[PDB]
Design a protein around this motif. Sequence first.
Motif, short mmCIF file in Angstrom:
data_model
loop_
_atom_site.label_atom_id
_atom_site.label_comp_id
_atom_site.label_asym_id
_atom_site.label_seq_id
_atom_site.Cartn_x
_atom_site.Cartn_y
_atom_site.Cartn_z
N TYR A 109 0.84 -1.20 0.00
CA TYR A 109 0.00 0.00 0.00
C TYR A 109 0.87 1.24 0.00
O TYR A 109 1.90 1.30 0.67
N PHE A 110 0.43 2.23 -0.75
CA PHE A 110 1.14 3.49 -0.90
C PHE A 110 0.15 4.62 -0.77
O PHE A 110 -1.06 4.45 -1.05
N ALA A 111 0.63 5.79 -0.34
CA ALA A 111 -0.26 6.94 -0.16
C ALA A 111 0.26 8.20 -0.84
O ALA A 111 1.47 8.49 -0.87
N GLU A 112 -0.68 8.99 -1.30
CA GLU A 112 -0.40 10.39 -1.69
C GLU A 112 -0.27 11.27 -0.45
O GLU A 112 0.57 12.14 -0.43
N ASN A 113 -1.04 11.03 0.60
CA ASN A 113 -0.90 11.81 1.83
C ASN A 113 0.23 11.26 2.71
O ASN A 113 0.15 10.11 3.16
N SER A 114 1.24 12.08 3.00
CA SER A 114 2.35 11.60 3.82
C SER A 114 1.84 11.19 5.23
O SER A 114 2.32 10.22 5.83
N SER A 115 0.87 11.95 5.73
CA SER A 115 0.27 11.67 7.03
C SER A 115 -0.49 10.32 7.10
O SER A 115 -0.60 9.73 8.20
N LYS A 116 -1.00 9.85 5.97
CA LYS A 116 -1.57 8.50 5.93
C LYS A 116 -0.49 7.44 6.13
O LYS A 116 -0.64 6.51 6.95
N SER A 117 0.60 7.57 5.38
CA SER A 117 1.73 6.64 5.57
C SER A 117 2.33 6.73 6.97
O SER A 117 2.74 5.72 7.55
N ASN A 118 2.35 7.93 7.55
CA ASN A 118 2.83 8.09 8.91
C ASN A 118 2.09 7.21 9.93
O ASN A 118 2.67 6.81 10.95
N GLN A 119 0.84 6.85 9.64
CA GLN A 119 0.07 6.00 10.55
C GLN A 119 0.59 4.57 10.67
O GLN A 119 0.16 3.84 11.55
N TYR A 120 1.43 4.14 9.76
CA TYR A 120 1.91 2.78 9.76
C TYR A 120 3.35 2.62 10.11
O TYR A 120 3.86 1.51 10.07
N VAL A 121 4.03 3.72 10.40
CA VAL A 121 5.46 3.71 10.76
C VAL A 121 5.74 2.72 11.91
O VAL A 121 6.67 1.92 11.84
N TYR A 122 4.87 2.72 12.92
CA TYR A 122 5.00 1.79 14.07
C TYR A 122 4.10 0.55 13.98
O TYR A 122 3.89 -0.13 14.96
N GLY A 123 3.57 0.26 12.80
CA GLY A 123 2.75 -0.92 12.59
C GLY A 123 1.33 -0.54 12.22
O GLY A 123 0.97 0.64 12.19
N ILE A 124 0.53 -1.55 11.95
CA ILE A 124 -0.90 -1.38 11.66
C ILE A 124 -1.61 -0.62 12.79
O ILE A 124 -1.47 -0.96 13.94
N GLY A 125 -2.36 0.42 12.43
CA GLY A 125 -3.03 1.24 13.43
C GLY A 125 -2.05 1.98 14.33
O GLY A 125 -2.41 2.45 15.40
N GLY A 126 -0.80 2.11 13.88
CA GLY A 126 0.21 2.69 14.72
C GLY A 126 0.79 1.76 15.79
O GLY A 126 1.63 2.22 16.59
N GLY A 127 0.35 0.49 15.80
CA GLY A 127 0.82 -0.52 16.77
C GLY A 127 0.75 -0.01 18.20
O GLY A 127 -0.25 0.56 18.61
#
Length: 208
Positions: A109-127
């Motif tokens: 999965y890829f995003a145009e919104n950087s903030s959407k991708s930021n939600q997965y940096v620490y895992g699904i749902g932000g872990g």
Amino acid sequence: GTILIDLSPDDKEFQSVEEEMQSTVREHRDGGHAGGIFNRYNILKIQKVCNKKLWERYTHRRKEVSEENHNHANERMLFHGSPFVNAIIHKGFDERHAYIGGMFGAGIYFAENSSKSNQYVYGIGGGTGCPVHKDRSCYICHRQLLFCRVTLGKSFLQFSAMAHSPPGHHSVTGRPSVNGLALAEYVIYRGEQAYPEYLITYQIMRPE
Ligand SMILES: Cc1cccc2c(=O)[nH]c(-c3ccc(C(F)(F)F)cc3)nc12
Ligand SMILES: [Zn+2]
């Protein structure tokens, strides 16, 4: 074979990458639960990811897709956030970086919104958040996103309120469909259809 070359903040490449990161922040429907509460980032570093083998693998697949799509790769630059950012830059994208529970099936999965991708940096749902403070909204720990070159080819459009691409397509586009402000999301089913070009190290900033 991967080397990471730092970009100077004075370099035009640094600046256009930072502007795409900063300008694609939006508000999220979880109110910051997964990725934290912020309107902007503090960018600490941007590095170019250089690996000849991964690049050739990407260009080879790009040429295959393009020849199936009237010489049009439909290449985009998109964000990707993952706990596996360190494996991706060394080994490339593959089946192990897929999101099995994703809304468009098990793909990458890829995003145009950087903030959407930021939600997965620490895992699904932000872990459970940063490993140091267990905080999904940590303002201290350093985060990393990838800014990637992605071949979409013929993309299947899904209006929305490792598997295979839908037959006759090379990707799926998740078109934002109630939230009028959200940008699109994209999914590929072959790891060779993306190259991780920039590694961005940042912090989210607390609103003042
Ligand atoms: C859904 C979605 C939309 C837009 C951008 C993204 C994005 O940047 N990353 C992920 C992501 C989800 C799961 C995993 C994991 F299972 F941990 F390997 C890794 C990355 N999902 C996205
Ligand atoms: Zn932290």
